[PDB]
Scaffold this active site. Structure first.
Site, PDB file in Angstrom:
ATOM      1  N   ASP A 265       1.175  -1.453  -0.282  1.00 44.57           N
ATOM      2  CA  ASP A 265       0.173   0.088  -0.363  1.00 44.57           C
ATOM      3  C   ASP A 265       0.952   1.305   0.707  1.00 44.57           C
ATOM      4  O   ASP A 265       1.691   0.790   1.435  1.00 44.57           O
ATOM      5  CB  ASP A 265      -0.764   0.193   1.480  1.00 44.57           C
ATOM      6  CG  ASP A 265      -2.152   0.820   1.277  1.00 44.57           C
ATOM      7  OD1 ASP A 265      -2.020   1.930   0.536  1.00 44.57           O
ATOM      8  OD2 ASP A 265      -3.324   0.754   1.140  1.00 44.57           O
ATOM      9  N   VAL A 266       0.339   2.478  -0.849  1.00 39.76           N
ATOM     10  CA  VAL A 266       1.470   2.884  -1.090  1.00 39.76           C
ATOM     11  C   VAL A 266       1.483   3.718  -0.322  1.00 39.76           C
ATOM     12  O   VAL A 266       1.670   4.685   0.555  1.00 39.76           O
ATOM     13  CB  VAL A 266       1.234   4.227  -2.744  1.00 39.76           C
ATOM     14  CG1 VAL A 266       1.666   3.293  -3.496  1.00 39.76           C
ATOM     15  CG2 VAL A 266       0.239   4.571  -2.756  1.00 39.76           C
TER      16      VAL A 266
ATOM     17  N   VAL B 140      -8.334   8.293 -19.795  1.00 41.82           N
ATOM     18  CA  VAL B 140      -7.807   7.492 -20.262  1.00 41.82           C
ATOM     19  C   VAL B 140      -8.778   5.860 -20.592  1.00 41.82           C
ATOM     20  O   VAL B 140      -9.038   6.085 -19.152  1.00 41.82           O
ATOM     21  CB  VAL B 140      -6.491   6.595 -19.530  1.00 41.82           C
ATOM     22  CG1 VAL B 140      -5.660   5.335 -20.076  1.00 41.82           C
ATOM     23  CG2 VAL B 140      -5.171   8.280 -19.493  1.00 41.82           C
TER      24      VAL B 140
ATOM     25  N   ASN C 139       3.539   4.430 -10.015  1.00 39.69           N
ATOM     26  CA  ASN C 139       1.920   4.546 -11.320  1.00 39.69           C
ATOM     27  C   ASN C 139       1.053   4.452  -9.538  1.00 39.69           C
ATOM     28  O   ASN C 139       0.101   5.135 -10.373  1.00 39.69           O
ATOM     29  CB  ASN C 139       1.996   3.862 -12.223  1.00 39.69           C
ATOM     30  CG  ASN C 139       0.972   3.399 -12.565  1.00 39.69           C
ATOM     31  OD1 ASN C 139       0.458   4.018 -13.720  1.00 39.69           O
ATOM     32  ND2 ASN C 139       0.151   2.262 -11.831  1.00 39.69           N
TER      33      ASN C 139
ATOM     34  N   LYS D 108      -1.105  15.294  -7.665  1.00 39.65           N
ATOM     35  CA  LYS D 108      -0.375  15.397  -9.004  1.00 39.65           C
ATOM     36  C   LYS D 108       0.117  16.323  -9.477  1.00 39.65           C
ATOM     37  O   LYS D 108       1.331  16.009 -10.647  1.00 39.65           O
ATOM     38  CB  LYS D 108      -1.767  15.049 -10.195  1.00 39.65           C
ATOM     39  CG  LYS D 108      -2.748  13.034  -9.770  1.00 39.65           C
ATOM     40  CD  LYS D 108      -2.050  12.224 -10.116  1.00 39.65           C
ATOM     41  CE  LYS D 108      -1.769  11.399  -9.239  1.00 39.65           C
ATOM     42  NZ  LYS D 108      -0.713  10.434  -9.896  1.00 39.65           N
TER      43      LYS D 108
ATOM     44  N   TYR E  95      -6.310  15.454  -4.957  1.00 37.96           N
ATOM     45  CA  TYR E  95      -5.708  14.819  -5.908  1.00 37.96           C
ATOM     46  C   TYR E  95      -5.006  15.574  -7.215  1.00 37.96           C
ATOM     47  O   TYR E  95      -3.979  15.390  -7.113  1.00 37.96           O
ATOM     48  CB  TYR E  95      -6.937  14.221  -6.876  1.00 37.96           C
ATOM     49  CG  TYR E  95      -6.908  13.127  -7.677  1.00 37.96           C
ATOM     50  CD1 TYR E  95      -5.551  12.201  -7.915  1.00 37.96           C
ATOM     51  CD2 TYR E  95      -6.702  13.667  -9.329  1.00 37.96           C
ATOM     52  CE1 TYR E  95      -5.896  10.777  -9.140  1.00 37.96           C
ATOM     53  CE2 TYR E  95      -6.547  13.093 -10.005  1.00 37.96           C
ATOM     54  CZ  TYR E  95      -5.743  11.911 -10.622  1.00 37.96           C
ATOM     55  OH  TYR E  95      -5.260  11.509 -11.079  1.00 37.96           O
TER      56      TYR E  95
HETATM   57  N1  LIG Z   1      -7.323   6.478 -15.200  1.00 37.12           N
HETATM   58  C1  LIG Z   1      -7.197   7.667 -15.615  1.00 37.12           C
HETATM   59  O1  LIG Z   1      -8.360   7.885 -16.662  1.00 37.12           O
HETATM   60  C2  LIG Z   1      -6.238   8.333 -15.255  1.00 37.12           C
HETATM   61  C3  LIG Z   1      -5.614  10.017 -15.924  1.00 37.12           C
HETATM   62  C4  LIG Z   1      -5.216  10.149 -15.893  1.00 37.12           C
HETATM   63  C5  LIG Z   1      -4.276  10.208 -14.370  1.00 37.12           C
HETATM   64  N2  LIG Z   1      -4.197   8.637 -14.303  1.00 37.12           N
HETATM   65  C6  LIG Z   1      -3.484   8.545 -13.096  1.00 37.12           C
HETATM   66  O2  LIG Z   1      -2.944   6.855 -13.538  1.00 37.12           O
HETATM   67  C7  LIG Z   1      -2.111   5.353 -12.343  1.00 37.12           C
HETATM   68  C8  LIG Z   1      -2.324   5.039 -13.003  1.00 37.12           C
HETATM   69  O3  LIG Z   1      -4.075   5.127 -12.704  1.00 37.12           O
HETATM   70  P1  LIG Z   1      -5.314   3.723 -12.955  1.00 37.12           P
HETATM   71  O4  LIG Z   1      -6.585   4.683 -13.474  1.00 37.12           O
HETATM   72  O5  LIG Z   1      -5.021   2.527 -13.920  1.00 37.12           O
HETATM   73  O6  LIG Z   1      -5.276   2.275 -12.238  1.00 37.12           O
HETATM   74  P2  LIG Z   1      -6.763   1.721 -11.964  1.00 37.12           P
HETATM   75  O7  LIG Z   1      -6.566   0.728 -13.622  1.00 37.12           O
HETATM   76  O8  LIG Z   1      -7.412   2.328 -10.909  1.00 37.12           O
HETATM   77  O9  LIG Z   1      -5.359   0.927 -11.002  1.00 37.12           O
HETATM   78  C9  LIG Z   1      -4.663   1.252  -9.948  1.00 37.12           C
HETATM   79  C10 LIG Z   1      -3.765   0.009 -10.190  1.00 37.12           C
HETATM   80  O10 LIG Z   1      -2.565   0.240  -8.706  1.00 37.12           O
HETATM   81  C11 LIG Z   1      -3.492  -0.480  -7.376  1.00 37.12           C
HETATM   82  N3  LIG Z   1      -3.659   0.118  -6.247  1.00 37.12           N
HETATM   83  C12 LIG Z   1      -4.587   1.192  -5.948  1.00 37.12           C
HETATM   84  N4  LIG Z   1      -4.357   1.464  -4.769  1.00 37.12           N
HETATM   85  C13 LIG Z   1      -3.089   1.717  -4.412  1.00 37.12           C
HETATM   86  C14 LIG Z   1      -2.492   1.446  -3.116  1.00 37.12           C
HETATM   87  N5  LIG Z   1      -2.990   2.702  -2.523  1.00 37.12           N
HETATM   88  N6  LIG Z   1      -1.860   1.346  -2.876  1.00 37.12           N
HETATM   89  C15 LIG Z   1      -0.705   0.158  -3.776  1.00 37.12           C
HETATM   90  N7  LIG Z   1      -1.348   0.150  -5.341  1.00 37.12           N
HETATM   91  C16 LIG Z   1      -2.889   0.530  -5.586  1.00 37.12           C
HETATM   92  C17 LIG Z   1      -3.990  -1.285  -8.246  1.00 37.12           C
HETATM   93  O11 LIG Z   1      -4.126  -2.373  -6.942  1.00 37.12           O
HETATM   94  P3  LIG Z   1      -4.906  -2.626  -5.493  1.00 37.12           P
HETATM   95  O12 LIG Z   1      -6.116  -2.000  -5.902  1.00 37.12           O
HETATM   96  O13 LIG Z   1      -4.740  -4.071  -5.222  1.00 37.12           O
HETATM   97  O14 LIG Z   1      -4.104  -1.631  -4.840  1.00 37.12           O
HETATM   98  C18 LIG Z   1      -3.602  -1.445  -9.190  1.00 37.12           C
HETATM   99  O15 LIG Z   1      -2.698  -2.597  -9.731  1.00 37.12           O
HETATM  100  C19 LIG Z   1      -2.530   7.381 -10.935  1.00 37.12           C
HETATM  101  O16 LIG Z   1      -0.996   7.727 -10.819  1.00 37.12           O
HETATM  102  C20 LIG Z   1      -3.405   7.659 -11.837  1.00 37.12           C
HETATM  103  O17 LIG Z   1      -3.288   9.447 -10.703  1.00 37.12           O
HETATM  104  C21 LIG Z   1      -5.424   7.837 -14.485  1.00 37.12           C
END
Ligand SMILES: NC(=O)c1ccc[n+]([C@@H]2O[C@H](COP(=O)([O-])OP(=O)(O)OC[C@H]3O[C@@H](n4cnc5c(N)ncnc54)[C@H](OP(=O)(O)O)[C@@H]3O)[C@@H](O)[C@H]2O)c1
Ligand SMILES: NC(=O)c1ccc[n+]([C@@H]2O[C@H](COP(=O)([O-])OP(=O)(O)OC[C@H]3O[C@@H](n4cnc5c(N)ncnc54)[C@H](OP(=O)(O)O)[C@@H]3O)[C@@H](O)[C@H]2O)c1
Lengths: 660, 662
Positions: A78-79, A208, A105, A180, A176
């Site tokens: 957990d980060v 995304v 990430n 970021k 948030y």
């Molecule tokens: N998706 C978007 O629309 C979007 C847009 C801009 C930026 N981002 C950025 O992209 C990154 C990836 O996001 P995503 O949307 O692709 O994520 P996502 O599909 O929710 O996947 C998150 C991943 O991170 C893990 N995770 C979640 N909370 C955690 C914690 N407290 N400790 C450790 N691991 C954790 C999850 O597994 P567990 O839940 O098992 O921990 C999973 O492996 C983030 O930094 C986010 O701010 C995303």
């Protein structure tokens, strides 16, 4: 594509946080396909096991040998838990003998609350998980990378964290946005100290296309989630504004809450006794329904009712209310005489789907490339960028060409306001919060008392000595208008106390209590993760804590100050001040937009005590005295009651970042 | 397995300008090794054949088939010859049937002169080769890419073109810096119109370790080249400064020149006949020698002497000098009584090496990654970037983490000049250059005459009618202080005439004579390369041509204005206005630094009539009139005599090289 990149990352070792799904899971897969060894870490073992098994299958089909040893997992990472992150570094070195790439990430969504409604524990969780965790890992890994002669740290930021020189507002998401913006600001300010061995870059994708935005396993998408939160906040803000408008013309707050407690739109709308604001509110609520949902019949849910009462209490509006002054905070959800039934939705699904397509249309219409990138597309870009060896200190934008146009950009001040505006301070109260910035706090206190004729400057300090040091710089006649309040528990309690003792302030100037440290990555004495966490607490959380009270005060202006650097200093303090300036601007910009939707309408602006270029910093006492005087002029410019005379003028006093 | 990256570019077709050597040659090589088909173009057939042979040989090794057909060349393709560029596109389509990637890589170094010494033909050559050539190719390939549904255009810019929102000065290289800034500004302002099908990005490397930078076969390295030109400019600037200080004290220019023509440091140092400024100059020159070189014994070469006389003539300092006004311009290098001997060097080899080490050290010390990237490192980064499908409108920075700290950000204006400072305009002469921007030129004329008490506003126009329209907006009592000068040949001649008739100005406001076109990539009526070349002439070269004269005027302040957009317009004019703002800021930043090195010390600042955010543009008459009034206040802020560095280091820096948006 995915079978023909085996040469791109051959033998490179990557630690990826949140490596089980979304962008992280696709980066883990593509790094493996490109010949890399990966340690994928996350909380849940089940997603990690399935993701790793799928990658190992593909590696087999490509024709890798020894596939099982190329991809490893660690669950329960957990980060927000630093001990579990140290475990991830230890497991990577045990499996693979080295780390080449650190991919920061993992990211949480955070509080999803306006700043006036957000808890300090929720803010801290978001900053710990999204920002401080990244520094924790860099602290442990960067020395290993420097010793082996090479490495790459990549922070996964967001488009909503802004870009260099251009902050962006992200209303309802300030924790948030700051986290970021922080990830990118670290790359901009610290890449100098990670070189020459380590490249340090960020990516800032926007929305995304994948399972999390789409919606997976019964669960609604992120556009729909934002749409539902916009309607909840619209109802809270509309009930809140009615109550405040009623209280401003002298309706007792107990009478407003007794009438809101009946929680009946039909009755409230047609009842003569109810104040006009509540009648009008209930009429407007009664026209918003669809025939299934209940929000046209009830003003409030327990959750919205709890948030309303907390806003009234935080503004000091219960200080003279018999019942409400003593009611336990734990009953804030329990004062409604009737509640919407569990059976039917409060909010109409048609208004949720409309807000959701307004959010979507808004982003989709600003993409140069016409469609949102997929998780695969963002992961692909990430794996291509990780192969470059000539970039450091940059944020890549794999966003689909996302371009949100705004004019929220750090300005250097050289300009002033009219004595008539300053003469409106006459007889008013102002609060200055600070400790170490004695020359700046004294000149500002002098300007408010001697030039603007304020009756009272409440100097809220960490210690009695901090008060005495400012008071000693003022003439005896000026000091007669300086009041001391020393924090005894937390800043919010000190602000509550100042408000109950000396009344509502016209201006609040927030300055950090502590100076920045003079260290970062030096082998002899590095900034530890706990010290960096304290820098975040003292320079970011501190402003949020002041802001969440100040934003509830009628006719008040809020001024946030980013850190100074001592003259002649040549340490990484200057880099840390620029890290704070950028990160705090995400806050200032977001809060300025949220506050315009609140009935209190509090302007928020930021003043910077450190310049962009270190050789332009003051270098003798004359330049220091010039800067102290310019600082007080900038505080009066954004802190005196604001002069819309003009659409251009009105934009120029909300969410600005001005450097002196 | 270890070398397989064919997944990145298999089957993609690239056209690469300057594809036979340097970065372009390494891009062609790495795209081919990543499975790409390449059309490499350049001038020399012989270099193209070697580059193509090496790539084809390296393909065959790592095991490609059908290899000779994958890498093609076209010689005699010169970015200053637009017909040859059209040939390169036709040859790519003939060889491969499509174009996926356009890599705009070829560029020239340009004039390598201070703005006040640079020829208009030298400036035009640089902008045509480095900037207009990229638009020419974009114009021809964009419709091909849009029709097939995909494409990538990559402009090879430079770190010294600056970055988004942050201009950088490149002294001695203003033409080059504008051209490189222009390449980036096209990406930032036009990517919207190349989407959704076409990705449009730039790269901005700094110094790149290869043949070009090191130098070979007795040809100097770029650091050594920059070092020698720094010494030549320092001697020109020192002689010029001594001449000007002597003239300001009241020595006749014919007297100064008669003494300089002796061209003998030792005699000048000791003779009492000589003004103090020339004696001190000769003494400093006499102590800079190394026992081999001649610059310690002669002040001037014919080249430096020609540059000096041109500066004095263009400042109007020959207007009352009988012999010099009538001298033909042809003879500017022929007036020395003695010239340095042809066999011995003018400049000392040791001070060139020390200036080259100083230039090298400044760069290297600013690299986060400690080492200049190689050509191969930049090409490799470029090939990885071209595989991404989610980036558009960005500048990548494969520079080794080059970070040059500066505070040149574009800013919105909310400022206040003291009435005391504005009152120094009383009795002074101001020049306003313009035609189409009638409301802005009229409010600025009115502010100078009525609020600042200027004696005379010379309104320099393209037509009498343009003057008549500004004059019709003014009260009869203000209009009494307005003078017409209609351009009859060129702006430089009109400035020399205004100077000769009505004397030295205190403020020069430069505004473009023509409005921007309302088109760009539309299939129905695109902006042609010739129309784009006229936009460059009217909005960039125009300001260069004013600036070259203004920068020689004692106690003058120069104000450059970037384009407006008509209220209600929804065309690409807005994107062209933002392209010009960014590109002109490279000029403004570079000129401000060069001018501080000149004895005249002319401040230069930029005012922008178009906002960055289109929804923030004036929407009604009231907002238009407010902007018009704010424009004239912005011109006063940067046009009135400025704050001394002595009064405040901070304030001095704010008022030099700024870009301010009203
Ligand atoms: N998706 C978007 O629309 C979007 C847009 C801009 C930026 N981002 C950025 O992209 C990154 C990836 O996001 P995503 O949307 O692709 O994520 P996502 O599909 O929710 O996947 C998150 C991943 O991170 C893990 N995770 C979640 N909370 C955690 C914690 N407290 N400790 C450790 N691991 C954790 C999850 O597994 P567990 O839940 O098992 O921990 C999973 O492996 C983030 O930094 C986010 O701010 C995303
Ligand atoms: N190298 C650096 O230090 C550096 C730093 C920053 C940016 N840049 C930029 O990087 C790009 C590449 O420069 P480089 O240093 O790699 O150049 P270079 O070593 O001089 O490469 C020259 C290549 O371009 C061709 N070329 C030269 N003049 C041409 C013309 N007028 N028309 C068409 N082709 C021409 C050459 O062949 P022919 O002579 O046969 O035509 C050769 O193929 C340029 O855009 C430059 O602005 C370079």
């Amino acid at each position: 594509f995915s079978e023909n990149i085996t040469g791109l990352h051959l033998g490179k070792v990557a630690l990826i946080t949140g490596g089980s799904a979304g962008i992280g899971g696709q980066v883990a897969r593509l790094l493996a396909l490109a010949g890399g060894k990966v340690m994928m870490v996350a909380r849940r073992e089940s997603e990690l096991a399935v993701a790793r098994a799928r990658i190992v299958s593909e590696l087999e089909d490509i024709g890798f040998a020894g596939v099982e040893r190329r991809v490893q997992t660690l669950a329960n990472v957990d980060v927000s838990n630093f001990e579990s992150l140290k475990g991830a570094v230890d497991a990577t070195l045990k499996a693979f003998g080295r780390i080449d790439y650190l991919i920061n990430n993992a990211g949480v969504a955070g509080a999803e609350d306006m700043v006036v409604d957000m808890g300090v524990d929720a803010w801290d969780y978001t900053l710990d998980a999204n920002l401080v965790s990244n520094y924790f890992l860099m602290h442990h890994v960067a020395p290993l990378m420097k010793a082996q002669g090479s490495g790459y740290i990549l922070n996964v930021s967001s488009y909503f964290g802004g870009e260099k020189y251009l902050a962006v507002a992200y209303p309802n998401r300030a924790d948030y946005a700051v986290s970021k913006a922080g990830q990118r600001a670290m790359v901009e300010s610290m890449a100098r100290y990670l070189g020459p061995e380590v490249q340090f870059n960020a990516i800032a994708p926007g929305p995304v296309d994948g399972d999390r935005l789409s919606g997976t396993g019964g669960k609604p998408g992120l556009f729909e989630r934002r749409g539902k939160l916009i309607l909840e906040n619209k109802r809270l803000n509309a009930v809140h504004a009615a109550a405040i408008k009623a209280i401003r013309r002298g309706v007792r707050v107990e009478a407003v809450l007794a009438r809101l407690a009946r929680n009946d739109t039909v009755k409230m709308s047609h009842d003569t006794n109810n104040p006009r604001e509540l009648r009008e509110l209930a009429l407007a609520c009664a026209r918003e329904g669809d025939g299934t949902c209940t929000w046209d019949q009830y003003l409030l849910t327990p959750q919205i009712a709890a948030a309303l009462v907390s806003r009234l209490r935080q503004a000091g509006l219960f200080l003279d209310a018999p019942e409400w002054s003593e009611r336990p905070v734990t009953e804030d959800g329990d004062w409604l005489l009737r509640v919407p039934p569990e059976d039917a939705p409060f909010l109409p699904a048609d208004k949720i789907a409309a807000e959701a397509k307004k959010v979507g249309g808004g982003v989709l219409s600003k993409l140069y490339l016409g469609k949102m990138p997929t998780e695969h597309d963002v992961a692909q870009a990430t794996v291509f960028f990780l192969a470059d060896r000539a970039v450091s200190g940059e944020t890549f934008m794999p966003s689909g060409g996302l371009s949100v146009e705004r004019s929220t950009t750090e300005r250097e001040l050289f300009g002033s306001p009219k004595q008539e505006r300053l003469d409106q301070m006459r007889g008013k109260t102002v609060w200055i919060i600070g400790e170490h910035l004695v020359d700046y706090l004294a000149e500002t206190a002098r300007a408010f008392i001697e030039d603007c004729h304020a009756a009272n400057v409440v100097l809220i300090t960490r210690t009695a000595e901090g008060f005495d040091a400012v008071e000693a710089q003022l003439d005896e006649d000026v000091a007669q208008s300086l009041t001391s309040l020393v924090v005894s528990s937390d800043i919010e309690a000190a602000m509550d106390e100042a408000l109950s003792q000396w009344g509502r302030p016209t201006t609040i100037l927030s300055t950090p209590f502590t100076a920045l440290p003079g260290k970062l990555f030096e082998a002899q004495d590095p900034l530890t993760p706990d010290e960096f966490r304290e820098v975040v607490a003292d320079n970011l959380t501190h402003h949020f804590r002041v802001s969440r009270r100040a934003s509830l005060y009628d006719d008040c202006q809020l001024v946030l100050t980013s850190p100074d650097v001592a003259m002649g200093d040549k340490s990484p303090a200057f880099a840390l001040a620029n890290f704070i300036k950028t990160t705090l601007h995400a806050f200032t910009a977001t809060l300025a937009v949220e506050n315009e939707r609140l009935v209190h309408d509090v302007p928020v602006n930021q003043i910077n005590l450190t310049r962009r270029v270190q050789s332009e910093e003051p270098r003798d006492l004359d330049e220091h005295l010039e800067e102290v005087r310019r600082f007080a002029r900038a505080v009066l410019l954004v802190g005196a009651p604001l002069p819309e005379d003009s659409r251009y003028r009105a934009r120029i006093y909300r969410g600005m970042s001005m450097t002196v």
